[PDB]
Each structure stands twice: as C-alpha cells, then as structure tokens.
Amino acid sequence: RPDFCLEPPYTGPGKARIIRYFYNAKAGLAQTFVYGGGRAKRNNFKSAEDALRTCGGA
C-alpha cells in the first residue's frame, strides 16, 4: 500500500473549504474532509473512487 495512505488527513494552511477525500486507515473507507486549498499531502483525493483505487489495497 503506498506509504502515505494511513496518515491522517491534512487541511493545510489555506483558507478554502474544498471537500476532498482521504483513505481512513481504521475503517478502510474513503471519507470526506475539508481541504484548505494549498500544500496538500498525498492522502488527498478528488473522489472516493480515486482514494480506493490508490489506497484501498493492501
């Protein structure tokens, strides 16, 4: 599994409220989070389906 997939989400310092997806380590689900619009980390997807294709598999 890529090495960023089990990290908590990262809002960053931006002031936007963009609804992105992260792969939730505990649950194994794609979940929404509020992204601030800059300085993303890699557990940050535009859709649930992208989060699962990248992070869902062991």
Question: Which CATH code is given to the segment(s) 1-58?
Answer: 4.10.410.10
| Residue 23, Ramachandran bin (φ over 0: left; ψ between -120 and 50: alpha; else beta) | beta
Count how many Cα atoms sit within 13 Å of the Cα of residue 40 in the half-sphere of its side chain: 17
- How many C-beta atoms surround the C-beta of residue 51 within 10 A? 23
**What are 29's two structure tokens?**
């689900």
Resolution (A): 1.1
Is the four-CA dihedral 28, 32, 33, 35 of positive or negative sign? positive
DSSP codes joined into one string, 1-56: --TTTTSPP---S----EEEEEEETTTTEEEEEEE-SSS--SS-BSSHHHHHHHHS
Method: X-ray
Q: What ranges do the domains of the chain cover? A: 1-58
The neighbour count for residue 35, using CB atoms within 10 Å, is: 23
Q: How far apart are CA 58 and CA 55, in angstroms?
A: 8
